[PDB]
Design a protein around this nucleic acid. Structure first.
Lengths: 155, 50, 208, 60
RNA sequence: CGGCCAACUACGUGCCAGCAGCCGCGGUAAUACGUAGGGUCCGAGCGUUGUCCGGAAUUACUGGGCGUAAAGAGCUCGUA
RNA sequence: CUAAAACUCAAAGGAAUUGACGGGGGCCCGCACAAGCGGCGGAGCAUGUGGAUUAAUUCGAUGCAACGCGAAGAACCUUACCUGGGUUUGACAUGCACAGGACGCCGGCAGAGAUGUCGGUUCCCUUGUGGCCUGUGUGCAGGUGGUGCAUGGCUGUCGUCAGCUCGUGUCGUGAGAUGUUGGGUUAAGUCCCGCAACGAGCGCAACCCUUGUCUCAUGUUGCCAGCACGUUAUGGUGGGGACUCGUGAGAGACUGCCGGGGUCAACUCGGAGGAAGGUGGGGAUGACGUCAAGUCAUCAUGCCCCUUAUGUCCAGGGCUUCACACAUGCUACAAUGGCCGGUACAAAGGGCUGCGAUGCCGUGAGGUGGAGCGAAUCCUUUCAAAGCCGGUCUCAGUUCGGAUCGGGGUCUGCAACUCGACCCCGUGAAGUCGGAGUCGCUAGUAAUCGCAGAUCAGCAACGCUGCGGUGAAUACGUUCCCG
């Protein structure tokens, strides 16, 4: 990364739903090196959302993403022994990555004992704004317009 | 291990390769059997008969 | 420890093996016999520099090729010492050997012999720099050589301090696999201890 | 190892298990390959010297 | 009989005994210490010491210098 | 303010040159930070080290660059350490006599063993004596005894970082400089532009190995479509190089072409074709030098010390001791899971006093017995696990986890108590995802799952060296930390 920007990997389209969002989600939720379990988990969550909310999984997933997609983030930079939390706008790719990361991260702190309905429940909550990752999203926005005091450095 | 008495992270790999072929002769004309054992070969080559 | 042996670097590209035979069950016995006879040859004769010692062994037949500088010391007109080597091997029981001894046409262009000469001249309490001067001049006299590097390490001059000194001339491209680089190592015994002499001789490239 | 230890290794043990390798060229009991009878140091030295018919630098 | 400065090998001693005009030689291979051979310069003389001139353009009249090597007074006024 | 002498040294100084150094700067790189994934420090266990004990707990290693390191294998041996009993030209060699035809083998008794005593067996020359050794020495052999701040050889580190020089010319009175400085680019002193420099060597790159495509040759133990013979036991068999594969030879990647930036330049961005596009992926290869870096325990070696001993044989014991600390790993703390049943796909390697199969007997380590192989055949089962399917468990110190502990066994070894591994039953401790801090990694990579090998009779291997299966996130950018 010292010489120049790194190349970007291609994204394989999904054969079942035809959107890169589900394959990005299954990549993000992948753990320990087992794909098959990962797509079966995410497809089970999609089907439970299908049977629960009564609407299509793609539209509600995109709506949840919009409800979780942030616009500003916080970057720590040090000078003279003091670290300042400058607010910086976010590229769309980082916004989507952060949204998926937050969803999957708050997918694992539940008590309801299996992954598929955990994911389905948080998808429904994020669609309705009742989730936990959304709370962190408005928290990040709150510090975005809260920490405006350090912006003249422009780093 | 390259070094005597320590430096385990430095090492050297060696190989030993042996190449083998077969020649099967049909219809053993007796002159062939007479002249076969007389053939002298390089020391690096070993041949056995079955 | 930086450089690997140049002879061992090109053991399958430029240079060839030293001993050739085939064995599976008696491989260990064969190699132990090789080391025993090589130790005997190295220990026994030293007044005549031995360029190389190659061994060939098939069935009961054995033959030893001893490449030396001058064979007159190693083979007299009456052949006492050649038969002495034969009998010394016979006590070692290497069975029968077709003992062959060969002289070298260019003793000045052989790294091992040059190293032996430098070591003996250092044993004569001669200044090392003069010995390297004369060795480099004599080696570069021959036309086909293209480079030479000569290095000695030890207690040079009798001082109580380690010293390693190297003198070079021409091209000695060690990093090339297709370069016929002759490598010679030898040891000089002095009053203060040990001296190590290394010689690299570069004589053109080879193309297959 | 010592000369006496080398000879006692060469000597016939009175029990089957009292035998070990004891590399021929030097006498170093550790890291001895039974294929060659040479310890790792002497194996390396002779492999570089080209005195073992078949061994060579491995690269792949 | 190191180099200045014509003339080198062996034995004995090894930082001891000793040499030396300047720089310096002796701790096992000393052309430098002592003795033997050989050599060189002089020669009824040969060396050392003391004194003076030279080399010293190193008190510079012939024939030197003062930014940083030693050397411009802290600055002016003014008497011979 | 004016202003000496005795004494003492063989120099004190000025300018500039080449290195080294700075708790002096400026640029450029690197998983250095940042952006991410997974860990260590918390628990139990395996090793290694520090410290403490005793008879020894043999020795070496000691920031990076020691701490799963010498050691790729400590019950005796190993073993170099402690106790005790022998032995002296000795456990191992060579030379002389004084003396020789015996040493050398198989048993008996004593003895923990080493070792001591009896019983049977005794030399090939050819008389000069030698091949052999039996006592006394004579020369001595023996030191894992010391000095890696006297050494050779080998190795680590900066670091695969990009540097180290020369010939001719020119510039300086001269050491010397220039080239090698400046701008750009590159993985790079790789190359381009300008400039008193013009060129060339060792380093970079290429030559070597492996993987990715095609062509030719090629058929055994390998492949087996089209053919026949075999039918549940399978290329199994006669048979074909058609397809693989095995192993020899060759072609193919060169910024080769197009478009844009470019100094009509290096190079950079995108495209066309192609299996691969920008040194396609990865190895071996480690320049000049720094660290009095490590190793007299691989070996060799100058000097120093013992030599009836610090040499040498044997029996037992220790390196596995533990009130603690540190480091590297394994198992976990569970539902992305545990147990039960079914279900198919890898590679490489090894095998003679070894792989060892079918059957038989156990519940299981395993006992019987031996087919086929010195090995593309026979064994590692037609070779695995994760996978996929079906059942259950419905969240607890648990159907987790296995430590610790009692009992009964299997194997190897003369001998498993101190101190091997494995099997069966039973109890089932800590451990609820871990403070300050801190580590690894940029694509078949991280994350994992299994298999083989070396050392080895047996293993303490959760280590090391390799192979294969499934396979991600992120890099805006050099402000800060490190080299």
């Amino acid at each position: 990364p010292r010489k120049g920007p790194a190349p970007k990997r291609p994204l394989v389209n999904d054969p079942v739903y035809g959107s890169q969002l589900v394959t990005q989600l299954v990549n993000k939720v992948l753990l320990e090196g087992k794909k098959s379990l990962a797509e079966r988990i995410v497809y089970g969550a999609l089907e439970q959302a299908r049977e629960k909310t009564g609407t299509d999984p793609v539209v509600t997933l995109k709506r949840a993403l919009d409800n979780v997609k942030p616009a500003l983030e916080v970057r720590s930079r040090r000078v003279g022994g003091a670290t300042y939390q400058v607010p910086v706008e976010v590229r769309p790719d980082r916004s989507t990555t952060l949204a998926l990361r937050w969803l999957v991260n708050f997918s694992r702190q539940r008590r309801e004992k299996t992954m598929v309905e955990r994911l389905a429940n948080e998808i429904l909550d994020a669609s309705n704004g009742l989730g936990a990752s959304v709370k962190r999203r408005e928290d990040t926005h709150k510090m975005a317009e809260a920490n405006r005091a350090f912006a003249h450095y422009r780093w | 291990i390259r070094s005597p008495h320590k430096y385990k992270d430095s090492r050297e790999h060696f190989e030993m390769r042996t190449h083998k072929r077969l020649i099967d002769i049909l219809d053993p004309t007796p002159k062939t059997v007479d002249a076969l054992m007389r053939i002298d070969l390089p020391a690096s080559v070993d041949v056995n008969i079955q | 420890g930086q450089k690997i042996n140049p002879h061992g670097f090109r053991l399958g590209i430029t240079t060839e093996w030293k001993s050739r035979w085939y064995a599976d069950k008696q491989y260990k016995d064969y190699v132990k016999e090789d080391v025993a006879i090589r130790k005997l040859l190295a220990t026994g004769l030293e007044r005549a520099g031995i360029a190389d010692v190659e061994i060939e062994r098939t069935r009961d037949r054995v033959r030893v090729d001893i490449h030396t500088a001058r064979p007159g010391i190693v083979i007299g007109r009456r052949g006492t010492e050649a038969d002495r080597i034969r009998a010394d091997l016979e006590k070692l029981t290497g069975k029968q050997v077709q003992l062959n001894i060969l002289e070298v046409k260019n003793p000045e262009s052989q790294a091992q012999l040059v190293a032996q000469g430098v070591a003996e001249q250092l044993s004569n309490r001669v200044a090392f720099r003069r010995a390297m001067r004369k060795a480099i001049q004599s080696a570069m006299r021959q036309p086909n050589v293209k480079g030479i590097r000569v290095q000695c390490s030890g207690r040079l001059g009798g001082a109580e301090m380690s010293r390693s000194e190297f003198y070079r001339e021409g091209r000695v491209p060690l990093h090339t696999l297709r370069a016929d680089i002759d490598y010679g190592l030898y040891e000089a015994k002095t009053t203060f201890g040990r001296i190590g002499v290394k010689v690299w001789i570069y004589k053109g490239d080879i193309v297959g | 190892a010592k000369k006496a230890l080398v000879h006692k290794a060469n000597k016939k043990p009175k029990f089957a298990v009292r035998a070990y390798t004891r590399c021929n060229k030097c006498g170093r009991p550790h890291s001895v390959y039974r294929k060659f009878g040479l310890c790792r140091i002497c194996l390396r030295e002779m492999a570089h010297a080209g005195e073992l018919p078949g061994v060579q630098k491995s690269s792949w």
